[PDB]
Amino acid sequence: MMNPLIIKLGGVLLDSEEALERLFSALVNYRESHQRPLVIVHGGGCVVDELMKGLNLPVKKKNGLRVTPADQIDIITGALAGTANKTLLAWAKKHQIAAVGLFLGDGDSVKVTQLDEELGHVGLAQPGSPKLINSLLENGYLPVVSSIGVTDEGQLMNVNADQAATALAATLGADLILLSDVSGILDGKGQRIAEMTAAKAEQLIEQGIITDGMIVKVNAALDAARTLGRPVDIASWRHAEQLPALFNGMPMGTRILA
Amino acid sequence: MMNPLIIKLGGVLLDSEEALERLFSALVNYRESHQRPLVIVHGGGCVVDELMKGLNLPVKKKNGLRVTPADQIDIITGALAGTANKTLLAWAKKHQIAAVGLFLGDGDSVKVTQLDEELGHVGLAQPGSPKLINSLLENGYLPVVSSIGVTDEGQLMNVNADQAATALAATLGADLILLSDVSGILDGKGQRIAEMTAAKAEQLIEQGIITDGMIVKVNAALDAARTLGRPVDIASWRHAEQLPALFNGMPMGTRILA
Numbered sequence: 001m002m003n004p005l006i007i008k009l010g011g012v013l014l015d016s017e018e019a020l021e022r023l024f025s026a027l028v029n030y031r032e033s034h035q036r037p038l039v040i041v042h043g044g045g046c047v048v049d050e051l052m053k054g055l056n057l058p059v060k061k062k063n064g065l066r067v068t069p070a071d072q073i074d075i076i077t078g079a080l081a082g083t084a085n086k087t088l089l090a091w092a093k094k095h096q097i098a099a100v101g102l103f104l105g106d107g108d109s110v111k112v113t114q115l116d117e118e119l120g121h122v123g124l125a126q127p128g129s130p131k132l133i134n135s136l137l138e139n140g141y142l143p144v145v146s147s148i149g150v151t152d153e154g155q156l157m158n159v160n161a162d163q164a165a166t167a168l169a170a171t172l173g174a175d176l177i178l179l180s181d182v183s184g185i186l187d188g189k190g191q192r193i194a195e196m197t198a199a200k201a202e203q204l205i206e207q208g209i210i211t212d213g214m215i216v217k218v219n220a221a222l223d224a225a226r227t228l229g230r231p232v233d234i235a236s237w238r239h240a241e242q243l244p245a246l247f248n249g250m251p252m253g254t255r256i257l258a
Numbered sequence: 259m260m261n262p263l264i265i266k267l268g269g270v271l272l273d274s275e276e277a278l279e280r281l282f283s284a285l286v287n288y289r290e291s292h293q294r295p296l297v298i299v300h301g302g303g304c305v306v307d308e309l310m311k312g313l314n315l316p317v318k319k320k321n322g323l324r325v326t327p328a329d330q331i332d333i334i335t336g337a338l339a340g341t342a343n344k345t346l347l348a349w350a351k352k353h354q355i356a357a358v359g360l361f362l363g364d365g366d367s368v369k370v371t372q373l374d375e376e377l378g379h380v381g382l383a384q385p386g387s388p389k390l391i392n393s394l395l396e397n398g399y400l401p402v403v404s405s406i407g408v409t410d411e412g413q414l415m416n417v418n419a420d421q422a423a424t425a426l427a428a429t430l431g432a433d434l435i436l437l438s439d440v441s442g443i444l445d446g447k448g449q450r451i452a453e454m455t456a457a458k459a460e461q462l463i464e465q466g467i468i469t470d471g472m473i474v475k476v477n478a479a480l481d482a483a484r485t486l487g488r489p490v491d492i493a494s495w496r497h498a499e500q501l502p503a504l505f506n507g508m509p510m511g512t513r514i515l516a
């Protein structure tokens with residue numbers, strides 16, 4: 001079978017019915033017109049932030065990662081591994097797509113360990129086994145994977161979805177597309193940056209242009225690009241008219257080179 | 259492959275580390291000493307009730323089923339399909355069991371439709387396709403299935419775990435064990451009832467002995483027993499010493515006959 005294509009979904013997309021409909025319409029069109037098997041990895045920080053306020057709990061992010069206390073990992077797991085994942089499975093079902101929801105621990109797809117005691121239950125994702133997902137793909141299912149993982153000792157871990165997507169890409173030897181609320185990485189004037197290299201990323205980071213979750217996003221993309229020896233794109237899921245060309249390889253945001 | 263055995267987990271078990279440890283110890287022992295493939299189906303009303311109070315939302319059950327408003331289905335899905343499911347996946351991992359988490363919609367394992375507009379997003383579960391789960395079992399994985407499902411139109415549904423377990427049993431032609439906080443169905447004096455028939459169940463229901471979720475539980479068990487033409491047991495997960503014999507077919511609670 002061909003190298004799969006992982007489409008990572010994140011941002012406020014998950015909270016827009018119209019955006020979800022336009023996205024799945026495009027997914028069906030792609031699936032029915034391409035032999036390359038698809039895999040979806042998703043985040044859902046917005047679903048979490050919303051649930052947190054509903055509980056009046058603060059949200060602190062250190063170096064682009066969400067501090068995840070032991071007293072919050074179960075709730076976060078629920079919002080990400082449960083609500084976010086099953087919402088996407090429901091849209092897949094609505095569009096007659098046979099999908100299967102998974103989290104990083106299923107089939108040890110992506111191995112996770114505690115990244116930093118200061119972050120709590122935040123996991124460091126690394127390549128795992130492609131056996132389960134490859135079998136699902138060969139059988140014609142669309143794996144939809146959340147970014148919650150579990151350590152060999154049985155501790156649930158919250159993994160940044162971009163890093164989770166990159167680790168899965170390495171595991172499956174898959175092409176990768178990171179979809180967000182913005183059209184790629186923006187410069188100091190808020191304009192889209194067409195191409196990105198490690199050198200340029202370092203420069204923009206030194207200058208404070210790339211910050212917060214985008215530093216994590218670009219670092220994950222660069223990691224995937226060098227690991228796969230293939231370009232990785234960071235693009236938007238907002239514009240319906242751009243979705244078809246995007247999924248077909250047309251650069252619509254920021255293309256990470258090696 | 260042999261007919262699988264579905265072990266349904268529910269009650270406050272999900273909130274006891276000691277109980278979970280004793281259970282998984284017994285599961286590993288069984289798996290390593292029996293060729294019959296295992297499948298876990300789980301509920302988690304307690305995880306939901308706890309999350310609801312955390313949001314100060316009331317919990318109303320009509321005829322043993324939780325009224326599930328549209329404004330609560332996502333939160334419930336998170337607690338059941340996310341937290342509860344992944345907690346069990348974590349314990350499986352801790353005991354070196356290769357498990358795979360699923361919800362009723364994965365592989366259309368169990369078909370669900372809206373049961374009653376008065377209940378909101380509560381689903382009526384019916385047999386689906388055994389293809390996905392059979393393939394997972396043949397490949398050596400332990401499917402751990404939550405009771406959240408999805409309609410063909412893409413609407414998430416909350417299904418009572420006992421009914422979900424029975425529908426899956428029919429789908430897979432599996433033996434079934436329903437584990438709860440009590441040692442089977444109790445009589446008017448709180449004593450365990452060894453055997454149960456449809457006639458006896460009707461009698462006890464008419465007399466008010468069997469009420470609330472137990473009416474749903476016994477009706478689900480009787481349905482499974484007549485559909486499979488096999489006895490179904492309702493037993494407790496509380497007593498560690500009884501777990502081994504229980505999983506080996508020894509009647510430890512209430513055995514439903516036809």
Ligand SMILES: Nc1ncnc2c1ncn2[C@@H]1O[C@H](COP(=O)(O)OP(=O)(O)O)[C@@H](O)[C@H]1O
Pocket residue numbers: 009010011043044045162179180181182184185186187209210211212213214217
């Ligand atoms: N230079 C930058 N270019 C583009 N987005 C940036 C930049 N610096 C910070 N961002 C922030 O990064 C966000 C996207 O990353 P993130 O918040 O992690 O969400 P997700 O990964 O779920 O899409 C944008 O919504 C933006 O607010």
Ligand SMILES: Nc1ncnc2c1ncn2[C@@H]1O[C@H](COP(=O)(O)OP(=O)(O)O)[C@@H](O)[C@H]1O
Pocket residue numbers: 267268269301302303420437438439440442443444445467468469470471472475
């Ligand atoms: N006659 C009865 N015998 C046993 N349990 C009963 C009876 N009538 C009501 N129950 C209630 O049913 C409960 C078990 O069913 P339920 O609440 O649905 O939980 P679960 O299915 O998650 O184990 C018991 O904890 C008990 O409080």
Ligand SMILES: CC(=O)N[C@@H](CCC(=O)O)C(=O)O
Pocket residue numbers: 010011042043044045046048064065066076080122123147158159160161162
């Ligand atoms: C550790 C960590 O930052 N996790 C992410 C996972 C979801 C996502 O990427 O949207 C988080 O917001 O909680």
Ligand SMILES: CC(=O)N[C@@H](CCC(=O)O)C(=O)O
Pocket residue numbers: 268269300301302303304306322323324334338380381405416417418419420
């Ligand atoms: C509809 C319905 O009653 N659902 C169950 C599902 C979980 C279980 O059985 O514990 C519920 O409590 O929300």
Ligand code: ALF
Pocket residue numbers: 009010011012042043044045046161162213
């Ligand atoms: F949805 Al995100 F980081 F917020 F992947």
Ligand code: ALF
Pocket residue numbers: 267268269270300301302303304419420471
């Ligand atoms: F855990 Al339950 F009904 F409360 F299956």
Ligand SMILES: [Mg+2]
Pocket residue numbers: 010043160161162213216217
């Ligand atoms: Mg991010």
Ligand SMILES: [Mg+2]
Pocket residue numbers: 268301418419420471474475
């Ligand atoms: Mg019940």
